[PDB]
């Protein structure tokens, strides 16, 4: 029930670097998740991945996803709505069974193992989801001092497109993306073989994942 843009890794771009994913054709179907990879996926991405058997990610990909999400978690953990939206984006990007329909590989290069690895890709993104995602993180204050968390996870982004641009720009060694990820908002409606990323999104004043008024303006008494 899966279609992927990439699956597993095909070597390093340079020494001291990390593994980079292998592009796969659209007709590729991944195997069933191992017991170990499934339990790890539930710990990293939440209980919504329990009954998932086919995923577009291997165990090494889930581990790399875990190590990077844990570095960014303390910056936004005070606001559950932002943390939920933040984790949900990169979890679907890495492992969703429909990853091949909203992620488009645009550039590759050869690794040290002499195999094709991802150099640049596009993520077709629903504007409304990205806008609400930015709205749930923009007002988070970092408990140390009184600066905005958006200065670190978003580089001081003022709108959602600059936010996603900061997340997707290739920033290896700086805990960022190992390759260039471009978020596209102009996917034509005539394209039926592609779709935009879209999911449940949680506002910072949502009842289930409410954030403090110091981190959310709509959570303050009006
Ligand atoms: C998902 O991701 C994939 C992969 O990234 C995307 O696939 C690409 O889609 C585009 C269209 O959306 C395709 O462009 C069309 O390509 C054909 C074939 O192009 C070759 O031959 C023509 C001659 O027939 C050459 O002119 C081309 O060289 C350059 O053309 C233009 C002119 O400047 C330039 O912008 C291109 O970047 C291209 O540069 C490439 O040339 C070298 C030399 O070979 C190449 O090695 C290198 O890759 C350079 O990037 C090219 O050699 C072409 O005929 C079409 O031309 C007509 O279309 C446009 C409108 O679309 C008109 O403006 C134009 O005047 C022509 O009338 C297109 O250029 C592209 O090939 C394709 N990539 C593939 C198949 O690998 C998907 O689009 C993505 N899906 C999304 C976003 O939904
Ligand atoms: C979130 O906030 C960001 C930051 O403000 C914002 O990004 C900016 O968006 C605007 C609008 O899309 C961009 O403005 C365009 O800029 C290009 C060139 O930009 C370069 O140079 C600046 C210099 O500071 C750099 O910062 C930037 O990164 C780029 O390197 C211009 O060419 C554009 O002018 C055309 O605009 C229209 C589109 O074509 C035309 O109608 C218009 O007539 C202009 O045409 C001219 O250019 C054509 C192309 O060459 C040419 O054919 C024509 O003859 C004519 O000369 C436009 O001004 C701006 O660059 C973005 N900046 C950054 C840093 O991203 C986001 O839009 C915002 N997002 C949301 C959702 O709110
Ligand atoms: C990007 O994300 C957006 C937010 O999730 C997406 O917007 C959603 O788009 C769908 C499809 O266009 C809408 O569903 C339609 O809603 C209308 C209106 O429904 C209301 O009115 C009718 C009576 O007129 C009533 O019967 C309903 O119960 C509602 O009260 C319906 O008429 C349609 O049949 C269809 O259900 C969503 O409502 C809309 N949601 C939001 C929050 O805007 C957008 O589609 C996404 N774009 C892409 C390209 O993925
Ligand atoms: C807080 C700052 C540093 C911003 C940029 C956050 C970055 C993290 C959370 C995000 C940005 C891009 C994401 C990312 C890019 C691409 C891949 C390759 C894939 O095969 C495994 C997931 C992985 C490795 C993920 C992990 C999480 C990353 C690295
Ligand atoms: Zn590996
Ligand atoms: Zn989800
Ligand atoms: Zn859109
Ligand atoms: Zn580019
Ligand atoms: Zn098409």
Author numbering: 20 to 241
Paper text:
To study the substrate scope of NCR1, the NTD (residues 1–249 of NCR1) was purified and crystallized with either ergosterol or cholesterol: ergosterol-bound structure at 2.4 Å (Rfree 26%) and cholesterol-bound structure at 2.6 Å (Rfree 26%). Ergosterol and cholesterol are highly similar in their chemical structure, but the quality of the electron density maps allows for clear discernment between the two in the NTD binding pocket. In particular, the double bond between C22 and C23 of ergosterol results in a more rigid iso-octyl chain, evident as density that is continuous with the ring system. The hydroxyl group of ergosterol is coordinated by Q80, 3.0 Å away. F109 and F112 are positioned underneath the ligand, allowing for pi-stacking with the sterol ring system. The ergosterol is bound ∼4.5 Å deeper in the binding pocket of the crystal structure compared with the cryo-EM structures.
The system consists of an integral membrane protein, called NCR1 in yeast, and NPC2, a luminal soluble protein that transfers sterols to the N-terminal domain (NTD) of NCR1 before membrane integration. NCR1 and hNPC1 share the same structural fold: an N-terminal domain (NTD), a middle-luminal domain, and a C-terminal domain found on the luminal side of the vacuolar/lysosomal membrane. The current transport model for the NPC system postulates that NPC2 binds sterols in the lumen and loads them into the NTD, which transfers the sterol to a tunnel that is formed by the middle-luminal domain and C-terminal domain of hNPC1 and NCR1, respectively.
